[PDB]
Design a protein around this ligand. Structure first.
Ligand SMILES: CCCCCCCC/C=C\CCCCCCCC(=O)OC[C@H](COP(=O)(O)OCCN)OC(=O)CCCCCCC/C=C/CCCCCCCC
Ligand SMILES: CCCCCCCC/C=C\CCCCCCCC(=O)OC[C@H](COP(=O)(O)OCCN)OC(=O)CCCCCCC/C=C/CCCCCCCC
Ligand SMILES: CCCCCCCC/C=C\CCCCCCCC(=O)OC[C@H](COP(=O)(O)OCCN)OC(=O)CCCCCCC/C=C\CCCCCCCC
Ligand SMILES: CCCCCCCC/C=C\CCCCCCCC(=O)OC[C@H](COP(=O)(O)OCCN)OC(=O)CCCCCCC/C=C\CCCCCCCC
Ligand SMILES: CCCCCCCC/C=C\CCCCCCCC(=O)OC[C@H](COP(=O)(O)OCCN)OC(=O)CCCCCCC/C=C\CCCCCCCC
Ligand SMILES: CCCCCCCC/C=C\CCCCCCCC(=O)OC[C@H](COP(=O)(O)OCCN)OC(=O)CCCCCCC/C=C\CCCCCCCC
Ligand SMILES: CCCCCCCC/C=C\CCCCCCCC(=O)OC[C@H](COP(=O)(O)OCCN)OC(=O)CCCCCCC/C=C\CCCCCCCC
Lengths: 308, 88, 316, 50, 316, 300
């Protein structure tokens, strides 16, 4: 089960990435339009006014339009949606980066299988009733399974460090995106002074142009900037929660406070990290799985199986 | 915005003052397109320009509000548990 | 489909890369079909079949709109390079050929039958209830009959597929074709990507119909068709690298010989022989995807497990 | 569920207020005065928004 | 679907070729809809009802845009070759005829019923565990399904040997496909050279325009030539596949299948030499996978039925 | 669908002809919507409201582009024949009515229920193990078959609806061929329009070129060919429903071949759909005979 190991911030970032992909696709379809920039030459040769004849054909106007689109419009105003698509693709790929690793996937699947089968175990309810037959043999087998999990997962710390690496990658990518987008968002202007030297072709040298979708691209850039800022705030909170409490050390003393048996130990490394995952999901899962960690609980359950 | 210039103006306003003959503005097609783009950007109200995008944003936020409890894990776990055990 | 097991990480990586290349091919083809043209303006001053380039007012060329359209069409046909015109069709054809090379494994009927039968028995063994008990080491009549039939079908299927290797040969040929085509694609695209220019000087000799000899043209989609091409080249490089790795994976170890020493030594069933040929190849592919499938299947081919299964069937 | 309901109803109130207030500014005839006399020759134009 | 088992490599190859030619037909038709115009400029100096072809200033034709459009439409209708105008429609029609000829096997109700019955009995023989148990040399439900299946096979064998309708239908389909391939190659190879970029039109519209002869450029002519070359290559491949299929039908009598190798390998040495349509569908099975016929052949020998009834008597 | 067997070769062949007719109708419809127009040019010189045609220099017309568009629209509305303008819509309507006639035998709930009952019992007899035993030589299934026979021999509404559908599908074919053949010669490339817009344009008579006429010609010819095929198929269908009586079915061949000779002669709707069964594949009818004979019921 890969949905359960995803906290609220991960789903929020996934939906923000989906929205950013939609923004990029909309920007690309905006770039599909043929009519992009409209240019007019400068210094052309009850008050009644008269129009200024520029003595230019339609083809000369099209040539001026394309020359000023290529050599006067800023590269950001032309290739913003493609950059958005690339950035949102990299953001989506790195969202499940700690999910797709082989060992990480194996330990996550083992943890969710063990935790789910513990959740439908009658003896968990039996031990909760004790705190506040055949199923005894199943509980003994599940205790050996928990010990096997402790020997199989706790020796490593790949998951927490790899999650920290993915979160740091998200934070730095948000920083770079915000930085260059704030630096280049002012380049998307309506009126552009185009100064290409096509005087030998059209007769004029200075042109004033307008980018027709400059306002729409500016709004799209500001919306993308807001989405990236929300993404960065979410990732900054993720970093704060990751680093303010040591996820290499899960204190089961909160279980010890209301549950009388004190034998359950303080898990370390990957076990503590994934238990913090499940605590963010639902703390009842951890408070129930706590009772399967003790050895004197196994001796009692062994005593109960002996009496049966 | 199909824009036509006002030949006679009076205090920054159109004056509006033997067969009839068309008015000759002496403007190119591209000068007309430039005027259309400039007046569409500058003097058209923002609501007319951004009504569909505002509607799309409002509907997306409405759908997110109507489907937030289905996606928020703390409530989604309880909801799927309730639905599954109640149906079965 | 059912063949998701047989596709390792390199195969799904090339599948996503081919999907992305098809996407950019569709985008480039849409742009080429819709708005690919050139704006050609005649050069008033001509010198040695070239433009002299010796308030301000415009230059009157005395050309109609249709003379301009004719000049644009003729200088798009004659003077713009074929790569700039047919890059989207070339990337579409290359992506289609790569997808055909990927799926010819699945579509060739002999290898399709072999892969489908292998996948079917592997999926029914992976979900067989007897596998959990065998790994944990009475039997239901239906379950015992299913287990006996499954054991006999695994034995006869092993005898059926061990005779010849046609799946491995097709995979070898497909990887070789995919790396050779990658080399050719990279070579010719790198050579011809420099011909996509924004400014093209055309000289088509239509002076009898237009009045000018040399025209200067702007190809509006050139720069875009530049960067997309570069992007395309990047994707191809990735594709080629992946294929190269797969080629190395074919050559560093013999793919037609599989040893169960990773399972027969750990498990009590040390009687498992070394399978060969196509069976070895698909089992190695499973190990590339997930060793759990091969580990759970490995109990169904040893004869000690057969003896204990017959003992359990007799005990019922 | 409560919070979703109050958020939806207050957003409905805001939407209806601003949309009803600004819905009358969508006009067919728009008089523009954009000061492009140096490029065109006329200052005030009477545009039609189809 | 269920008919995938009956389609050998030539059939699936032709199907993928046909879908590719459908893709190019759709593309050509879309482009013929959207950008199949031509740009016609009048010849200013007419010499013997032709074009003399005899700083610089543009030529003034004194023609409106609408006169240019009228000249374009008239010369496109009259003086453009019919191949350059209806190549994608002809390609679509040919591909649809290929699809209809290939799939009329599955749509003719008598042959479709025979093929569906054959597929159903082969698949339920594949699912039968007793078929594998007998070849390896008793459950009640297994016995019921087995007895029903052997009776099913005897009934089908008595039914299908009456007439070779399916084999004759396949012969007619292959013959139709090969003769249509020959005709397509002949006329397309003859008429592909008529797609030219530069054409001269002489339509006698001097009463409305003022010019007699015009020089026209067809912008889609080179792309249509590329598409025609692609279509010719695809049809050549399809025709070569059809040659191989016809040679496969004519190499050996497909109305006569001998189980001699199969019954020599197996303990049952009395599998009859079937003939006619059943032999034909079994030859197609061997073309897809010999294992299907290998496992189905045990249902035809009388010794297998004798031992089946002996084991039923032991069970009952 | 569920009635994969009740449709004989003529039904499926006409269905595919209808599909190809529908796609060419849609193609012609988008053709007429997107770029269908006509380019109209006046005759400058005049001789009794004509043009005389008394190096070369182009003829000036002093017409604006909008005057040309007005002439195009007016001549397209007035002097282009209505067939050349509404051929794809007529084809689309005809194919929609053809598909409605074909699928009304499927969609009417009474006939749909009867067909689904027969299909369900026929399929469950086809997969039943007891028919093989009977042919070598289920009681609730036999009682269900008898009850269905008593239910379905009451009326012949299915055969009557099939007959009515055949008559509509042949008379519509006759009308389509008559009107399309009569009016296919009105799709001309070059037309003459005399629309009297001299007060707005200055010219009276114009020569117009219809760019998509020739395509709309050959498609129509193509359409005619397809319709002919449809009609020919329907023609033989009429013969198939007039040479033999489908309301009475004789099981004589099967009851002679089988050991049981007590299979009665089936009548009414049961007879009609069993005739359809025999047209598709005689195995289903031969197999359903042994689920009807009361002697085999006594053996069951
Ligand atoms: C592998 C090859 C596959 C080829 C398939 C191509 C599919 C399209 C084929 C049909 C072509 C139709 C031609 C239409 C031309 C109509 C007249 C014309 O020239 O249109 C120009 C007109 C100019 O824009 P306006 O809106 O006037 O701008 C100013 C006002 N805002 O419109 C255009 O730009 C083109 C008109 C539509 C043509 C394109 C239609 C399909 C476009 C698909 C978009 C692809 C986006 C992909 C999104 C993600 C990209 C990473
Ligand atoms: C019953 C059918 C219902 C469906 C109908 C839906 C209508 C289509 C929806 C898309 C709307 C876009 C249409 C835009 C039209 C106006 C644009 C315009 O001014 O176009 C000018 C210009 C007119 O001249 P040309 O076509 O160059 O003439 C050359 C002479 N041979 O037209 C164009 O450029 C094309 C305009 C866009 C066309 C896109 C839609 C066409 C659809 C193609 C249908 C066939 C597709 C598959 C082909 C099958 C193989 C045969
Ligand atoms: C409740 C919350 C209300 C939100 C609405 C904000 C309105 C603020 C008004 C600001 C304002 O009036 O300033 C003007 C200013 C326009 O300035 P000019 O054009 O110079 O002036 C025109 C002269 N009238 O108006 C605005 O900025 C309007 C803001 C529009 C924002 C709407 C959001 C658009 C975002 C686009 C993203 C949507 C993409 C969807 C993806 C599609 C995927 C299929
Ligand atoms: C991350 C940090 C980024 C920092 C800034 C990096 C860029 C620095 C400046 C680069 C630059 O100017 O490059 C220009 C250069 C040349 O083009 P012009 O701008 O026309 O050149 C003429 C002058 N205007 O353009 C670029 O390289 C722009 C940058 C790349 C943009 C496109 C990137 C993505 C390309 C592939 C997109 C594919 C989209 C579609 C895929 C799916 C299809 C369905
Ligand atoms: C290295 C290997 C190279 C592979 C391609 C071969 C290219 C050879 C070059 C031929 C050439 O230059 O000829 C020019 C000639 C046109 O120019 P002209 O004006 O005749 O000559 C003037 C010279 N500029 O261009 C060509 O022949 C280029 C050939 C293009 C080959 C690309 C094939 C494209 C096939 C189309 C695929 C269709 C798929 C449709 C799918 C539909 C999906 C909706
Ligand atoms: C093998 C059989 C070969 C079939 C090809 C027949 C070719 C015969 C040629 C006859 C011929 O040349 O006649 C001329 C005549 C052209 O005449 P004009 O242009 O007036 O020429 C005037 C001359 N100065 O040519 C023709 O009639 C062309 C014949 C080809 C017909 C093609 C039919 C097109 C059918 C389209 C199918 C529609 C399907 C749409 C699918 C929809 C999917 C969304
Ligand atoms: C024999 C059977 C006859 C069939 C119908 C005959 C109708 C002819 C009526 C008499 C007549 O002259 O009608 C004129 C009149 C046209 O007149 P004008 O345009 O003025 O042209 C005058 C020509 N100089 O003809 C018609 O109206 C023809 C009517 C045929 C169209 C029927 C309507 C069908 C509409 C189809 C709906 C399309 C929806 C498409 C759905 C798209 C989904 C994506």
């Amino acid at each position: 089960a890969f949905r359960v190991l995803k906290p609220w911030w991960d789903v929020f970032t996934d939906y923000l990435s989906v929205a950013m992909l939609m923004i990029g696709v909309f920007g690309c379809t905006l770039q599909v339009m043929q009519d992009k920039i409209i240019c007019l030459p400068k210094r052309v040769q009850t008050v009644e006014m008269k129009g200024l004849k520029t003595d230019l054909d339609l083809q000369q106007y099209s040539f001026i339009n394309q020359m000023c689109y290529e050599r006067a419009l800023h590269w950001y105003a032309k290739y913003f949606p493609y950059l958005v698509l690339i950035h949102t693709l990299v953001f989506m790929l790195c969202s499940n980066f700690w999910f797709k690793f082989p060992g990480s996937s194996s330990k996550i699947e083992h943890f969710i299988s063990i935790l789910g089968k513990c959740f439908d175990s009658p003896w968990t309810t039996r031990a909760l009733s004790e705190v506040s037959k055949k199923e005894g043999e199943q509980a003994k087998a599940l205790f050996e399974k928990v010990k096997k999990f402790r020997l199989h997962v706790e020796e490593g710390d790949i998951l927490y460090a790899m999650y920290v690496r993915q979160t740091v990658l998200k934070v730095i990518k948000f920083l770079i995106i915000i930085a260059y987008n704030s630096a280049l968002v002012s380049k998307v202007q309506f009126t552009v002074d185009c100064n290409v030297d096509i005087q030998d072709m059209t007769g004029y040298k200075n042109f004033s142009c307008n980018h027709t979708m400059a306002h729409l691209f500016s709004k799209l850039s500001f919306c993308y900037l807001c989405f990236v800022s929300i993404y960065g705030l979410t990732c900054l909170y993720t970093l704060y929660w990751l680093f303010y409490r040591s996820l290499r050390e899960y204190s089961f003393e909160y279980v010890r406070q209301e549950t009388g048996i004190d034998d359950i130990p303080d898990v370390k490394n990957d076990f503590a990290f994934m238990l913090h995952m499940i605590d963010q999901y639902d703390p009842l899962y951890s408070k129930r799985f706590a009772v399967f960690l003790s050895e004197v609980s196994e001796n009692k359950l062994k005593q109960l199986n002996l009496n049966n | 915005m199909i824009c036509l210039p006002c030949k006679w103006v009076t205090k920054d306003s159109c004056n509006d003052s033997t067969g009839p003959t068309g008015i000759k503005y002496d403007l190119d097609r591209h000068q007309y397109n430039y005027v259309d783009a400039v007046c569409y950007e500058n003097r058209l109200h923002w609501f007319a320009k951004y009504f569909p995008y505002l509607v799309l944003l409002h509907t997306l936020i409405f759908l997110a509000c109507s489907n937030f409890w289905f996606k928020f894990p703390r409530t989604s776990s309880k909801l799927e548990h309730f639905v599954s055990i109640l149906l079965k | 489909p059912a063949y998701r097991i047989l596709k390792p990480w390199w195969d799904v990586f090339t599948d996503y890369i081919s999907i992305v290349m098809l996407m950019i091919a569709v985008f480039g083809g849409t742009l080429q079909v819709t708005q690919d043209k050139m704006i050609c303006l005649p050069c008033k001053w001509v010198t040695k079949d070239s433009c002299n380039d010796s308030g301000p007012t415009g230059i009157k060329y005395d050309l109609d709109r249709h003379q301009y359209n004719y000049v644009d069409a003729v200088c798009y046909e004659n003077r713009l390079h074929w790569f700039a015109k047919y890059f989207p069709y070339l990337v579409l054809l290359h992506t289609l050929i790569f997808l055909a090379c990927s799926n010819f494994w699945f579509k060739f009927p002999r290898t399709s039958s072999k892969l489908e039968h292998f996948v079917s028995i592997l999926l029914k063994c992976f979900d067989s209830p007897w596998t959990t008990r065998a790994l944990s080491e009475v039997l239901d009549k239906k379950e015992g009959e299913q287990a006996k039939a499954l054991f006999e079908k695994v034995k006869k299927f092993r005898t059926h597929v061990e005779e010849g290797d046609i799946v491995y040969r097709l995979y070898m040929r497909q990887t070789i074709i995919k790396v050779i085509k990658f080399a050719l694609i990279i070579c010719y695209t790198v050579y011809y990507v420099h011909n996509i220019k924004f400014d093209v000087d055309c000289t088509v000799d239509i002076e009898s119909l237009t009045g000018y000899r040399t025209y200067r043209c702007a190809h509006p989609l050139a720069t875009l068709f530049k960067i997309l091409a570069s992007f395309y080249i990047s994707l191809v490089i990735f594709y080629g690298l992946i294929c190269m790795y797969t080629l190395w994976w074919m050559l560093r170890r013999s793919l037609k010989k599989y040893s169960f020493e990773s399972i027969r030594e750990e498990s009590s069933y040390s009687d498992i022989p070394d399978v060969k040929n196509d069976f070895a190849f698909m089992l190695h592919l499973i190990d590339q995807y997930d060793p759990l499938y091969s580990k759970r299947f490995a109990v169904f081919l040893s004869e000690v497990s057969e003896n204990k299964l017959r003992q359990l069937n007799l005990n019922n």
